[PDB]
Design an enzyme around this catalytic site. Structure first.
Site, PDB file in Angstrom:
ATOM      1  N   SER A 143       0.826  -1.207   0.000  1.00 17.93           N
ATOM      2  CA  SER A 143       0.000   0.000   0.000  1.00 17.93           C
ATOM      3  C   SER A 143       0.862   1.259   0.000  1.00 17.93           C
ATOM      4  O   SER A 143       1.560   1.549  -0.973  1.00 17.93           O
ATOM      5  CB  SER A 143      -0.939   0.003   1.210  1.00 17.93           C
ATOM      6  OG  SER A 143      -1.858   1.082   1.148  1.00 17.93           O
ATOM      7  N   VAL A 188      -3.875   0.770  -3.002  1.00 15.59           N
ATOM      8  CA  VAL A 188      -3.517  -0.545  -2.469  1.00 15.59           C
ATOM      9  C   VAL A 188      -3.327  -1.567  -3.598  1.00 15.59           C
ATOM     10  O   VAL A 188      -4.173  -1.692  -4.487  1.00 15.59           O
ATOM     11  CB  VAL A 188      -4.554  -1.041  -1.404  1.00 15.59           C
ATOM     12  CG1 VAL A 188      -5.965  -1.125  -1.986  1.00 15.59           C
ATOM     13  CG2 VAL A 188      -4.134  -2.376  -0.795  1.00 15.59           C
ATOM     14  N   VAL A 189      -2.201  -2.277  -3.562  1.00 16.05           N
ATOM     15  CA  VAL A 189      -1.891  -3.302  -4.559  1.00 16.05           C
ATOM     16  C   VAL A 189      -2.267  -4.678  -4.020  1.00 16.05           C
ATOM     17  O   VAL A 189      -1.804  -5.085  -2.952  1.00 16.05           O
ATOM     18  CB  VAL A 189      -0.394  -3.287  -4.972  1.00 16.05           C
ATOM     19  CG1 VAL A 189      -0.129  -4.302  -6.082  1.00 16.05           C
ATOM     20  CG2 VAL A 189       0.027  -1.899  -5.418  1.00 16.05           C
ATOM     21  N   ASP A 233       7.866   9.153 -12.342  1.00 18.28           N
ATOM     22  CA  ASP A 233       8.103   8.583 -11.015  1.00 18.28           C
ATOM     23  C   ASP A 233       9.115   7.434 -11.030  1.00 18.28           C
ATOM     24  O   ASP A 233       8.859   6.361 -10.481  1.00 18.28           O
ATOM     25  CB  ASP A 233       6.773   8.133 -10.390  1.00 18.28           C
ATOM     26  CG  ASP A 233       6.860   7.927  -8.880  1.00 18.28           C
ATOM     27  OD1 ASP A 233       7.734   8.539  -8.228  1.00 18.28           O
ATOM     28  OD2 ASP A 233       6.040   7.151  -8.345  1.00 18.28           O
TER      29      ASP A 233
HETATM   30  N1  LIG Z   1       2.731  -5.452 -10.702  1.00 18.92           N
HETATM   31  C1  LIG Z   1       3.246  -5.694  -9.500  1.00 18.92           C
HETATM   32  N2  LIG Z   1       3.721  -6.913  -9.197  1.00 18.92           N
HETATM   33  C2  LIG Z   1       4.239  -7.164  -8.000  1.00 18.92           C
HETATM   34  N3  LIG Z   1       4.310  -6.225  -7.063  1.00 18.92           N
HETATM   35  C3  LIG Z   1       3.855  -4.982  -7.301  1.00 18.92           C
HETATM   36  C4  LIG Z   1       3.306  -4.688  -8.540  1.00 18.92           C
HETATM   37  N4  LIG Z   1       2.939  -3.411  -8.521  1.00 18.92           N
HETATM   38  C5  LIG Z   1       3.238  -2.917  -7.320  1.00 18.92           C
HETATM   39  N5  LIG Z   1       3.801  -3.870  -6.572  1.00 18.92           N
HETATM   40  C6  LIG Z   1       4.272  -3.719  -5.165  1.00 18.92           C
HETATM   41  O1  LIG Z   1       3.201  -3.112  -4.413  1.00 18.92           O
HETATM   42  C7  LIG Z   1       3.796  -2.436  -3.276  1.00 18.92           C
HETATM   43  C8  LIG Z   1       3.105  -1.074  -3.108  1.00 18.92           C
HETATM   44  O2  LIG Z   1       2.885  -0.460  -4.384  1.00 18.92           O
HETATM   45  P1  LIG Z   1       2.751   1.136  -4.555  1.00 18.92           P
HETATM   46  O3  LIG Z   1       1.425   1.538  -4.033  1.00 18.92           O
HETATM   47  O4  LIG Z   1       3.104   1.449  -5.956  1.00 18.92           O
HETATM   48  O5  LIG Z   1       3.880   1.709  -3.541  1.00 18.92           O
HETATM   49  P2  LIG Z   1       5.369   2.177  -3.984  1.00 18.92           P
HETATM   50  O6  LIG Z   1       6.190   0.961  -4.155  1.00 18.92           O
HETATM   51  O7  LIG Z   1       5.797   3.208  -3.010  1.00 18.92           O
HETATM   52  N6  LIG Z   1       5.174   2.849  -5.456  1.00 18.92           N
HETATM   53  P3  LIG Z   1       4.679   4.400  -5.419  1.00 18.92           P
HETATM   54  O8  LIG Z   1       3.466   4.513  -4.348  1.00 18.92           O
HETATM   55  O9  LIG Z   1       3.977   4.673  -6.849  1.00 18.92           O
HETATM   56  O10 LIG Z   1       5.767   5.371  -5.147  1.00 18.92           O
HETATM   57  C9  LIG Z   1       5.285  -2.240  -3.595  1.00 18.92           C
HETATM   58  O11 LIG Z   1       6.066  -3.042  -2.699  1.00 18.92           O
HETATM   59  C10 LIG Z   1       5.432  -2.734  -5.035  1.00 18.92           C
HETATM   60  O12 LIG Z   1       6.676  -3.421  -5.202  1.00 18.92           O
END
Ligand SMILES: Nc1ncnc2c1ncn2[C@@H]1O[C@H](COP(=O)(O)OP(=O)(O)NP(=O)(O)O)[C@@H](O)[C@H]1O
Ligand SMILES: Nc1ncnc2c1ncn2[C@@H]1O[C@H](COP(=O)(O)OP(=O)(O)NP(=O)(O)O)[C@@H](O)[C@H]1O
Ligand SMILES: Nc1ncnc2c1ncn2[C@@H]1O[C@H](COP(=O)(O)OP(=O)(O)NP(=O)(O)O)[C@@H](O)[C@H]1O
Ligand SMILES: Nc1ncnc2c1ncn2[C@@H]1O[C@H](COP(=O)(O)OP(=O)(O)NP(=O)(O)O)[C@@H](O)[C@H]1O
Ligand SMILES: [Au+]
Ligand SMILES: [Au+]
Ligand SMILES: [Au+]
Ligand SMILES: [Au+]
Ligand SMILES: [Au+]
Ligand SMILES: [Au+]
Ligand SMILES: [Au+]
Ligand SMILES: [Au+]
Ligand SMILES: [Au+]
Ligand SMILES: [Au+]
Ligand SMILES: [Au+]
Ligand SMILES: [Mg+2]
Ligand SMILES: [Mg+2]
Ligand SMILES: [Mg+2]
Lengths: 270, 284, 236, 264
Positions: free
Chosen positions: D17, D19-20, D135
Site C-alpha cells: 500500500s 492498495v496493490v 516517477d
Molecule cells: N505489478 C506488480 N507486481 C508485484 N508487485 C507490485 C506490482 N505493482 C506494485 N507492486 C508492489 O506493491 C507495493 C506497493 O505499491 P505502490 O502503491 O506502488 O507503492 P510504492 O512501491 O511506493 N510505489 P509508489 O506509491 O507509486 O511510489 C510495492 O512493494 C510494489 O513493489
C-alpha cells in the site's frame, strides 16, 4: 576461474561435522564471496579421486536455479574440498526441527502450500538432472537448502550423494540374461532416476510428519521393513487430498510404475 | 674530493652498525679524503661461498649503472677475507622499515600503505628497473628491504650487483622424451622479466606488509609458488576480508606482473603507463 | 484490580498494550512472581477478562537497547563498533544486578538479549518480564550423555551465557551465529572455538571486556561465574 | 483478450500500500496484480485519467510492466497488470541496509549497470512514444522470476504520485512552467535512483520531504550527499553528474545515456 589455491580461501566457522564430511564456511578472496566447503577424507570414506572423476565432472556441468551452485574442487592433504554456494537460509530440515522443538507440530509440521512450494522447486531441480541423464541419489529434507531470497535448491549432487548411497551402482557406472531374476538384472544394469522419485515421496512425508516413516528403527530394520512390507504412507491430519495420492504414486515398489519428474510436475497437488 | 673514491682501507673510519645480518654487515663509515659519511656493506667471501673472480662481472656493472633511482655505488675493495662495497648512505631508511613500524603498531590488518603512497614509491622503482633493463641488467632482488629512501624523499633501489647476486644464489643430462618437467626447466633460464614478477610481489608486500607465502619455510614457498597459479593480494593472508580497501586498478596492475609466463609480463616502460600509477603524489 | 484501565495504543504469547492508569503497559495472554526490583520488569497485578490474562506492568517509553543498536546499524556509525565500551558497562551492570536478584530468588530469566533490555523515560535499565516464560518450566553412572542432558536440565548459569552473547550483541550489533538457522546454532557453538567478540576493524574494545565475555561463554556451565562474581569483574 | 468484468477476477493477498492486491483471473488462468485506487481520495476522476489510461494501453515493451486492462469498481479504479514475483529493487536495498551491509556500498557496480540499462531502455521506449514516466525510483523497478527488469507505474499511478497539474521579459523558470517539463525530467530521476542503488537512499534522504524540495533548488547533489563508497569510480559518478544537471537542456537523452561508458 574459481581458485584451486588453498591459500585463497580463509577458513571460517564449521557448519557441520559428521563421520564422512565436514562442512566449513570460507571466504574466497578473488571472488569476494563467503562460500561453503565440504571437506571429505578420501581414505576414511574408502574412496579415491579416480573413483570420483565422473561425479566431479557431472557437478561441473549440471547447473540449474534449483541445484546448489558448484564452484570447484581440489585436494588438500588427505581431503577433497568441494567448493559451493553457501545458502544462508539453511535446510528445510532445520525448519522442521524448529517447529518440533517449539511444539507446533502435533497438527502437522509444514503447511500444504508450503510443502507444494518447496517440492515443486525440488522436482524442477530433479527434472533438469534427469534430462541430462543424471540421478541425484540422496533426496531428503536435509539436502533441500534455502536461500535468503526464498530460493529452493537441492544440495549434495555428485560426490556426496555417490558416497552415501553405495557408490558406482547406477546406470552411469551376461551374456544370455533370459534366466536372470529381475533383481540380478538391476544389479547388472544399475538403478535409474526413479530411485529419486521414491526418495521424493519419503521427503514429502518428512515435511508433513517431521520424520521418515521408520526413523526410530536401526538401519537394518529400516531396510527389512521397507522390503518385507507394502510401501509406507503418512500414517507410517490436515492433509487428506491429492497430497496422499501424490505420495502413493512416488512410493511404489516397482520403479517402472513410478512417474517421471515431468509427469509428477503436473498433478493437482502442485 | 676528488678523486676518485679511495680503495685504501685506512681512508675509511668505521662507525655505527646499521644491520648485522646473517651473511653481510652494513656499517656507516667516514671517508676522510672525500669528507663524506658513507655506507659500507661488508661481505665475508667465505661465509657466502664466493670469491672475487665470480664477483668481478657484478662489480663491473655496478660501476656503470648510475641513475637517480639507483643507490649510488662508489667503489669496492678487499679487506683481508671480506669484500667492502662502498656506497651512498641514505638517511630515510628502507620501505621495509616503514612496513615493520606499522606492523608493530597493529595498524596493518586493514592495509599497511595506501594506494597513493604505493603508487609514488613503485613508479620510482619502475624508473630504476627501466634504466637497468635498458642497460641489459637484471636486479634479481627487488623487495621492500631493497627500496631505500632519501631524507628529501627520493626513492632508490638498493643492492644491484653483488648483493642481489648473492641473495639469489648464482635438456642436458638424460633423454628429453623421458625427462621430468622440472629437469627440462633447468635450461630455460631467465631475463629482465623476472624483476617484473618480483615487482608484483613487492606491490603486495607494501599493501599487506609481507610476501604471499612468508609464513612457510623456504623450501615450501618454492613448492607452493611453482605448484599454484600466481598469487593475489590476499593469498596467504590470515584476515582476507579486511584488505577490501585496495581497488581494482591496483589489483589488475599486480596481475599483469604476476603471470607464470614471463613473455606475458609487461616491461617497466609499459607498467609506467598503467592507470594505477596516476595515484602518485609529491615524494612525501 | 478491575478496569479502570483505558485501552490505548498497541506497543506491542500474544499482544502488549499501553493503558492509562498513570502510564502503564498491560500484556494480553492466550501465578507469582513475587520478584520486585528496579532492574526487572515485574507485574503490578494480574487479572482475567475473557480468555485473556492481563498483566499490568510499568510502561517503558524509552524502547529497548536493540532499538538503539538498530538505529546505529541502519546508519554508518557501526564502523568502529556499535555501543561505546562505557555505555555497554553501564547498561550491562544494571542487567546483571537484575539477574543477581532473580537468581537469589531461585529464578531464571531464560531470555536475556538486547531486545529484552527495556529503557525507561527515567533512563532506567531493566530486563523484560519473564513470568509467562517461567510458567513453562537415581544412579546416573550408566546414562548416555544425551540422556544426561535431559535429566540434568539447566539452571541460572544459562542466563550467564545469554548475558555474554548480549555483550557481543551490544558491541557488534548481532549474536555470533545470527546468520544461521535457529536449530543450527547448537552445532555451530560446539564445533567451533567458544564464541568471542570476533566470532572486522569494528573493535576498539579493550582486553577487560573480551575477558569478561570469555568467562560467560564457557561451554561447561559450572565454569561460568555467578552474577555476583561477574559484578566484581574489572570491566564493571 | 483481457476481461473488463470484475466477476472474472478473484481477489487474494495484498502485496502493498492506493492498495496493490494479487488476484487470480480464471478465464485463461493467470495470477495478476491489481492496483486499487480510490478516485475521490486522490481528488481525481475518470475524465482526467482517460489520457493516462489510453497511453498505458498503447505502450508495450519488455522493460515496462505489462498493463492488461482497467475498469471502475464502485468508487474505485482497478488497474490490472502482470504480477512480478521478484519484488522491487528497493526491497533488496532495504534488506542490505537493515543488516548494515551497506558499508562500502549497497549494490555492486556491475549489478547497478545491468539493472539501470534495462530501466533506461524502458525509458527510451517511453520517450520515443512521446511519454514521460514521472516517477522513476528503485521502488518502481520490479524484478521478474526470469531475472527480468521492468519499470512499474507508468500512466495513472505515476501521474497521481506526481499530481494532476510576447515572452521577451519572461524569466526562464516562467517559460519552463508555461511550456511544461519534458522527458528530461525522467533523466534526472534516473540519476537519483542510481544514487539510491549505491547508497541505499536518495541524496537528501536525511532531511524531511518538502524541505528536500527547497534544498534541491538551493544546491546540487552527488553520491557523496547521502554520506567509504570508494568502490564506485570513474564512469559511474560521471554518468550520475550527466543526469543530475539543473538545466534539463544539458541532460542527455536516454539514447545518449545508453551509449555511455558505464552502460559496455
Ligand atoms: N505489478 C506488480 N507486481 C508485484 N508487485 C507490485 C506490482 N505493482 C506494485 N507492486 C508492489 O506493491 C507495493 C506497493 O505499491 P505502490 O502503491 O506502488 O507503492 P510504492 O512501491 O511506493 N510505489 P509508489 O506509491 O507509486 O511510489 C510495492 O512493494 C510494489 O513493489
Ligand atoms: N552449501 C551449503 N550452504 C549452507 N549450509 C550447508 C551447505 N551444505 C551443507 N550445509 C549444511 O552443513 C551441515 C552438514 O552437511 P552434510 O554433511 O550434508 O550433513 P547431512 O545433511 O547430515 N548429510 P549426511 O552427513 O551425508 O547424512 C548441514 O546442516 C547442512 O544443512
Ligand atoms: N646504503 C645504505 N644506506 C642506508 N642504509 C642501508 C644501506 N644499505 C643497507 N642499509 C640498511 O642496512 C640494513 C641491513 O642491510 P642488508 O645487509 O641488506 O640486510 P637485509 O636488507 O635485511 N637483507 P638480509 O640481511 O639478507 O635479510 C637494512 O636495514 C638496510 O636498510
Ligand atoms: N513493560 C513494557 N514497556 C514497554 N514496552 C514493552 C513492555 N513490555 C513489553 N514491551 C514491548 O512489547 C512488545 C511485545 O512484547 P512481548 O510480548 O514480550 O513479545 P516480544 O518482545 O516480541 N518477545 P518475542 O515474541 O519472544 O520476540 C515488544 O516490542 C516489547 O518491547
Ligand atoms: Au567416511
Ligand atoms: Au550433468
Ligand atoms: Au537367452
Ligand atoms: Au653476502
Ligand atoms: Au650497467
Ligand atoms: Au627424446
Ligand atoms: Au521471585
Ligand atoms: Au552413579
Ligand atoms: Au492513488
Ligand atoms: Au504510449
Ligand atoms: Au519583445
Ligand atoms: Mg547434505
Ligand atoms: Mg638490502
Ligand atoms: Mg510503485
Amino acid at each position: 576461474p574459481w581458485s584451486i589455491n588453498r591459500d585463497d580461501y580463509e577458513l571460517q566457522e564449521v557448519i557441520g561435522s559428521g563421520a564422512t564430511a565436514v562442512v566449513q564456511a570460507a571466504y574466497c578472496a578473488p571472488k569476494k564471496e563467503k562460500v561453503a566447503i565440504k571437506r571429505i577424507n578420501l581414505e576414511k570414506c574408502q574412496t579415491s579421486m579416480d573413483e570420483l572423476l565422473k561425479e566431479i565432472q557431472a557437478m561441473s556441468q549440471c547447473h540449474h536455479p534449483n541445484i546448489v551452485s558448484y564452484y570447484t574442487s581440489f585436494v588438500v592433504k588427505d581431503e577433497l574440498w568441494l567448493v559451493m554456494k553457501l545458502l544462508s537460509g539453511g535446510s528445510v530440515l532445520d525448519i522442521i526441527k524448529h517447529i518440533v522443538a517449539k511444539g507446533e507440530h502435533k497438527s502437522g509440521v509444514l503447511d500444504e502450500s508450503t510443502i507444494a512450494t518447496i517440492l515443486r522447486e525440488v522436482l524442477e531441480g530433479l527434472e533438469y538432472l534427469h534430462k541430462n541423464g543424471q540421478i541425484h541419489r540422496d533426496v531428503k529434507a536435509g539436502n533441500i537448502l534455502l536461500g535468503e531470497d526464498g530460493s529452493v535448491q537441492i544440495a549434495d549432487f555428485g560426490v556426496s550423494a555417490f558416497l552415501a548411497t553405495g557408490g558406482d551402482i547406477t546406470r552411469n557406472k551376461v551374456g544370455t540374461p533370459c534366466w536372470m531374476a529381475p533383481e540380478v538384472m538391476e544389479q547388472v544394469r544399475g538403478y535409474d532416476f526413479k530411485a529419486d522419485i521414491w526418495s521424493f515421496g519419503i521427503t514429502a512425508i518428512e515435511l508433513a510428519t517431521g520424520a521418515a516413516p521408520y526413523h526410530k528403527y536401526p538401519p537394518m530394520k529400516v531396510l527389512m521393513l521397507t522390503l518385507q512390507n507394502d510401501p509406507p504412507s503418512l500414517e507410517t491430519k490436515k492433509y487428506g487430498k491429492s497430497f496422499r495420492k501424490m505420495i502413493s504414486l512416488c512410493l511404489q515398489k516397482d520403479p517402472e510404475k513410478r512417474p517421471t519428474a515431468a509427469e509428477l510436475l503436473r498433478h493437482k497437488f502442485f
